Design a protein around this motif. Sequence first.
Motif, PDB file in Angstrom:
ATOM      1  N   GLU A 114       0.683  -1.046   0.365  1.00 15.32           N
ATOM      2  CA  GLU A 114       0.068  -0.031  -0.188  1.00 15.32           C
ATOM      3  C   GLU A 114       1.448   1.514  -0.475  1.00 15.32           C
ATOM      4  O   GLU A 114       0.716   2.023  -0.424  1.00 15.32           O
ATOM      5  CB  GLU A 114      -0.638  -0.241   1.427  1.00 15.32           C
ATOM      6  CG  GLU A 114       0.213  -0.086   2.218  1.00 15.32           C
ATOM      7  CD  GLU A 114      -0.871   0.042   4.111  1.00 15.32           C
ATOM      8  OE1 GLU A 114      -1.724  -1.624   3.711  1.00 15.32           O
ATOM      9  OE2 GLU A 114      -1.132   0.583   4.599  1.00 15.32           O
ATOM     10  N   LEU A 115       2.227   1.100   0.769  1.00 22.55           N
ATOM     11  CA  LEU A 115       2.618   2.670   0.945  1.00 22.55           C
ATOM     12  C   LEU A 115       3.516   2.960  -0.374  1.00 22.55           C
ATOM     13  O   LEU A 115       2.876   3.987  -0.649  1.00 22.55           O
ATOM     14  CB  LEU A 115       4.187   1.655   1.382  1.00 22.55           C
ATOM     15  CG  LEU A 115       5.266   2.872   1.896  1.00 22.55           C
ATOM     16  CD1 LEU A 115       6.499   2.389   2.762  1.00 22.55           C
ATOM     17  CD2 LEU A 115       5.854   3.735   0.786  1.00 22.55           C
ATOM     18  N   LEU A 116       3.818   1.910  -1.546  1.00 25.99           N
ATOM     19  CA  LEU A 116       4.170   2.166  -2.796  1.00 25.99           C
ATOM     20  C   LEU A 116       3.353   2.879  -3.956  1.00 25.99           C
ATOM     21  O   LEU A 116       3.767   3.548  -4.277  1.00 25.99           O
ATOM     22  CB  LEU A 116       4.610   0.630  -3.671  1.00 25.99           C
ATOM     23  CG  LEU A 116       6.168   0.159  -3.217  1.00 25.99           C
ATOM     24  CD1 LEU A 116       6.572  -0.950  -3.539  1.00 25.99           C
ATOM     25  CD2 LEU A 116       7.332   0.789  -3.593  1.00 25.99           C
ATOM     26  N   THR A 117       2.100   2.219  -3.683  1.00 25.22           N
ATOM     27  CA  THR A 117       1.120   3.261  -4.307  1.00 25.22           C
ATOM     28  C   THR A 117       0.988   4.401  -3.701  1.00 25.22           C
ATOM     29  O   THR A 117       0.372   5.599  -4.298  1.00 25.22           O
ATOM     30  CB  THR A 117      -0.276   1.667  -3.722  1.00 25.22           C
ATOM     31  OG1 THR A 117      -0.068   0.660  -4.254  1.00 25.22           O
ATOM     32  CG2 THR A 117      -1.670   3.010  -4.526  1.00 25.22           C
ATOM     33  N   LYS A 118       0.996   4.678  -2.509  1.00 34.10           N
ATOM     34  CA  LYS A 118      -0.108   5.732  -1.533  1.00 34.10           C
ATOM     35  C   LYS A 118       1.700   7.201  -2.544  1.00 34.10           C
ATOM     36  O   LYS A 118       1.132   7.941  -2.309  1.00 34.10           O
ATOM     37  CB  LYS A 118       1.481   5.337   0.222  1.00 34.10           C
ATOM     38  CG  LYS A 118       0.246   6.425   0.571  1.00 34.10           C
ATOM     39  CD  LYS A 118      -0.393   5.387   2.193  1.00 34.10           C
ATOM     40  CE  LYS A 118      -0.252   6.786   2.901  1.00 34.10           C
ATOM     41  NZ  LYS A 118      -1.934   5.797   3.419  1.00 34.10           N
ATOM     42  N   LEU A 119       2.869   7.251  -2.136  1.00 34.54           N
ATOM     43  CA  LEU A 119       3.536   7.751  -3.124  1.00 34.54           C
ATOM     44  C   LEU A 119       3.507   8.233  -4.452  1.00 34.54           C
ATOM     45  O   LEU A 119       3.071   8.897  -5.022  1.00 34.54           O
ATOM     46  CB  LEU A 119       5.404   7.309  -2.855  1.00 34.54           C
ATOM     47  CG  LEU A 119       5.849   6.384  -2.241  1.00 34.54           C
ATOM     48  CD1 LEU A 119       5.383   4.460  -2.413  1.00 34.54           C
ATOM     49  CD2 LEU A 119       6.945   6.618  -1.677  1.00 34.54           C
ATOM     50  N   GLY A 120       3.333   7.293  -5.640  1.00 33.19           N
ATOM     51  CA  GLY A 120       2.443   7.322  -6.712  1.00 33.19           C
ATOM     52  C   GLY A 120       1.886   6.515  -7.412  1.00 33.19           C
ATOM     53  O   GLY A 120       1.019   5.152  -7.087  1.00 33.19           O
ATOM     54  N   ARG A 121       2.518   5.756  -8.929  1.00 36.31           N
ATOM     55  CA  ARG A 121       2.836   4.570  -9.148  1.00 36.31           C
ATOM     56  C   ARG A 121       4.446   3.449  -9.922  1.00 36.31           C
ATOM     57  O   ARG A 121       3.901   3.639 -11.291  1.00 36.31           O
ATOM     58  CB  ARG A 121       1.650   4.595  -9.919  1.00 36.31           C
ATOM     59  CG  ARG A 121       0.422   5.843  -9.551  1.00 36.31           C
ATOM     60  CD  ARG A 121      -0.889   4.589 -10.552  1.00 36.31           C
ATOM     61  NE  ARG A 121      -1.335   6.349 -11.052  1.00 36.31           N
ATOM     62  CZ  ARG A 121      -1.475   7.415 -11.521  1.00 36.31           C
ATOM     63  NH1 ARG A 121      -0.474   7.634 -11.682  1.00 36.31           N
ATOM     64  NH2 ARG A 121      -2.660   8.397 -11.287  1.00 36.31           N
ATOM     65  N   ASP A 122       4.785   4.092  -9.238  1.00 38.89           N
ATOM     66  CA  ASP A 122       6.562   3.892  -9.733  1.00 38.89           C
ATOM     67  C   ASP A 122       6.990   3.400  -9.125  1.00 38.89           C
ATOM     68  O   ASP A 122       5.942   2.281  -7.608  1.00 38.89           O
ATOM     69  CB  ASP A 122       6.515   5.285 -10.383  1.00 38.89           C
ATOM     70  CG  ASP A 122       7.460   5.647  -9.050  1.00 38.89           C
ATOM     71  OD1 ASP A 122       6.980   5.506  -7.762  1.00 38.89           O
ATOM     72  OD2 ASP A 122       8.593   6.906  -9.081  1.00 38.89           O
ATOM     73  N   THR A 123       8.193   2.643  -8.789  1.00 34.49           N
ATOM     74  CA  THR A 123       9.154   2.165  -7.698  1.00 34.49           C
ATOM     75  C   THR A 123      10.459   3.265  -6.934  1.00 34.49           C
ATOM     76  O   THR A 123      10.183   3.990  -7.512  1.00 34.49           O
ATOM     77  CB  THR A 123       9.711   0.754  -8.377  1.00 34.49           C
ATOM     78  OG1 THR A 123      10.812  -0.145  -7.588  1.00 34.49           O
ATOM     79  CG2 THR A 123      10.258   1.345  -9.495  1.00 34.49           C
ATOM     80  N   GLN A 124       9.917   2.695  -6.037  1.00 35.00           N
ATOM     81  CA  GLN A 124      11.881   3.662  -5.268  1.00 35.00           C
ATOM     82  C   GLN A 124      12.666   2.586  -5.018  1.00 35.00           C
ATOM     83  O   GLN A 124      12.897   1.712  -4.369  1.00 35.00           O
ATOM     84  CB  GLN A 124      11.341   3.786  -4.014  1.00 35.00           C
ATOM     85  CG  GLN A 124      10.331   2.502  -3.202  1.00 35.00           C
ATOM     86  CD  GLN A 124       9.202   3.719  -1.871  1.00 35.00           C
ATOM     87  OE1 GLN A 124       8.574   3.896  -2.414  1.00 35.00           O
ATOM     88  NE2 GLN A 124       9.618   2.562  -0.712  1.00 35.00           N
ATOM     89  N   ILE A 125      14.082   3.152  -6.486  1.00 35.88           N
ATOM     90  CA  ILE A 125      15.626   1.752  -5.618  1.00 35.88           C
ATOM     91  C   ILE A 125      16.179   2.817  -4.712  1.00 35.88           C
ATOM     92  O   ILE A 125      16.934   3.600  -5.234  1.00 35.88           O
ATOM     93  CB  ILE A 125      15.690   2.179  -7.233  1.00 35.88           C
ATOM     94  CG1 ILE A 125      17.258   1.149  -6.851  1.00 35.88           C
ATOM     95  CG2 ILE A 125      15.947   3.236  -7.484  1.00 35.88           C
ATOM     96  CD1 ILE A 125      16.662  -0.284  -6.854  1.00 35.88           C
ATOM     97  N   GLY A 126      16.352   2.167  -4.148  1.00 32.15           N
ATOM     98  CA  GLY A 126      17.070   2.430  -2.182  1.00 32.15           C
ATOM     99  C   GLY A 126      16.269   3.427  -1.220  1.00 32.15           C
ATOM    100  O   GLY A 126      16.640   4.456  -0.794  1.00 32.15           O
ATOM    101  N   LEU A 127      14.819   3.248  -1.853  1.00 35.12           N
ATOM    102  CA  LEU A 127      13.949   3.763  -0.609  1.00 35.12           C
ATOM    103  C   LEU A 127      14.227   4.204   1.075  1.00 35.12           C
ATOM    104  O   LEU A 127      14.413   2.393   1.723  1.00 35.12           O
ATOM    105  CB  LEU A 127      12.714   3.902  -0.525  1.00 35.12           C
ATOM    106  CG  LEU A 127      11.249   4.842  -0.743  1.00 35.12           C
ATOM    107  CD1 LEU A 127      11.975   5.720   0.413  1.00 35.12           C
ATOM    108  CD2 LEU A 127      12.217   6.272  -2.324  1.00 35.12           C
ATOM    109  N   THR A 128      14.517   4.732   1.475  1.00 36.92           N
ATOM    110  CA  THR A 128      15.640   4.543   3.140  1.00 36.92           C
ATOM    111  C   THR A 128      14.480   5.013   3.893  1.00 36.92           C
ATOM    112  O   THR A 128      13.132   4.932   3.532  1.00 36.92           O
ATOM    113  CB  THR A 128      16.706   5.999   3.446  1.00 36.92           C
ATOM    114  OG1 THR A 128      15.926   6.893   3.225  1.00 36.92           O
ATOM    115  CG2 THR A 128      17.505   5.273   3.035  1.00 36.92           C
TER     116      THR A 128
END
Length: 87
Positions: free
Chosen positions: A50-64
């Motif tokens: 749900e987090l990933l969807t919360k940000l937007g609709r992409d991915t996070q390579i190295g999200l801290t």
Amino acid sequence: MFKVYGYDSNIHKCVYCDNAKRLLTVKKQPFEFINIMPEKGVFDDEKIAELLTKLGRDTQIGLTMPQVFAPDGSHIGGFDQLREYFK
């Protein structure tokens, strides 16, 4: 209420997790912590999904971590990033 996605101490350590929690308390805002890693094996795909969807609709390579989210439902960020939310 603010939503934080990170670690507490029982499963994983975190020095900036405590510092931020103090930031809010100083501002007097309702919030709650959430352990993204309920198992020493892997993080909680449920909350992480749900987090990933919360940000937007992409991915996070190295999200801290920890990742916070505004009451209404928006991505605020960490400390510095959130400090802007406070100002």
